[PDB]
């Protein structure tokens, strides 16, 4: 499962052209779910996410991480991530996940999140959407299970 | 070298609130410099940048690249891409160019994207910025060379 987090000051999601999520600081997630994913992979991206240490302390030094930061988390499902872009003009999309089973697993992950006591948005899991953000910084990571 | 790309309607980037660099429809590209690239290296992921085909066509198809599209592209620097985000809660730059040989490559990335004739907005290297987007789809690709 790939985690494509950008720290923001702000992010929203729309479809069509209403907000089905908004948050104000914290961070962005962009969610790729693979073939081979399972709740056990979900439970420790969900786990590095929400900790990684890269918000700002009360001296400037990245050392806390989102939930420390009173931040939330917006996720959104994107496919894209777990694309093979190795080669050529045109990525190619076969290490994504079912149909089915994908959903299961976002669903499982903004769960997890919840879970965690974190003010938690989405966007439908497979709908045309506008996702806006303030990326901070910019500070954006690419984690991985 | 690194580009994460976003496909945007719109993007900016300000420092400070000041806009330093923006764009309508187009790609946000967080840039990455690692430790041994070079000038080849810059060249060729501009090439796969400038021609990866994600934007929709007539019939709403993704198979156009940014500059079929009519599109344009801002180059904003991120060193937390070249990041190794394997284990523990703090991030390992190790893979990552120092600050000078980034600023370096990073500008020559810039110079190669406008050679192209390629309306191409920039941020500010190492400044704090703000990175104000709507990623459209969204749609978010990871490119490496
Ligand atoms: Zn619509
Ligand atoms: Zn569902
Ligand atoms: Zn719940
Ligand atoms: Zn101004
Ligand atoms: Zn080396
Ligand atoms: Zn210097
Ligand atoms: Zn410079
Ligand atoms: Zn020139």
Same mark, same amino acid.
């Given at each position: 499962?790939?985690?494509?987090?950008?720290?923001?000051?702000?992010?929203? &999601?729309?479809?069509?052209? @209403?907000?089905?999520?908004?948050?104000?600081?914290?961070?962005? &997630?962009?969610?790729?779910?693979? *073939?081979?994913?399972? @709740?056990? *992979?979900?439970?420790?991206? +969900? @786990?590095?996410?929400?900790? =990684?240490?890269?918000?700002?302390?009360?001296?400037? *030094?990245?050392?806390?991480?989102?939930?420390?930061?009173?931040?939330?988390?917006?996720? &959104?499902?994107?496919?894209?991530?777990?694309?093979?872009? @190795?080669?050529?003009?045109?990525?190619?999309?076969? *290490?994504?996940?079912?149909? !089915?089973?994908?959903?299961?697993? =976002?669903? =499982?992950?903004?769960?997890? +999140?919840?879970?965690?006591?974190?003010?938690?948005?989405?966007?439908?899991?497979?709908? !045309?959407?506008?996702?806006?953000?303030?990326?901070?910084?910019? &500070?954006?990571?690419?984690?991985?299970?």
């Amino acid at each position: 499962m790939i985690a494509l987090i950008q720290r923001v000051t702000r992010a929203s &999601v729309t479809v069509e052209g @209403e907000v089905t999520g908004e948050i104000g600081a914290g961070l962005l &997630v962009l969610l790729g779910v693979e *073939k081979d994913d399972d @709740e056990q *992979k979900a439970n420790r991206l +969900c @786990e590095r996410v929400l900790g =990684y240490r890269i918000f700002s302390d009360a001296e400037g *030094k990245m050392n806390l991480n989102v939930q420390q930061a009173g931040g939330s988390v917006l996720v &959104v499902s994107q496919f894209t991530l777990a694309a093979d872009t @190795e080669r050529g003009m045109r990525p190619s999309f076969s *290490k994504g996940a079912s149909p !089915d089973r994908a959903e299961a697993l =976002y669903d =499982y992950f903004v769960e997890r +999140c919840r879970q965690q006591e974190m003010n938690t948005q989405t966007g439908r899991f497979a709908a !045309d959407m506008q996702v806006s953000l303030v990326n901070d910084g910019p &500070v954006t990571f690419w984690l991985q299970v």
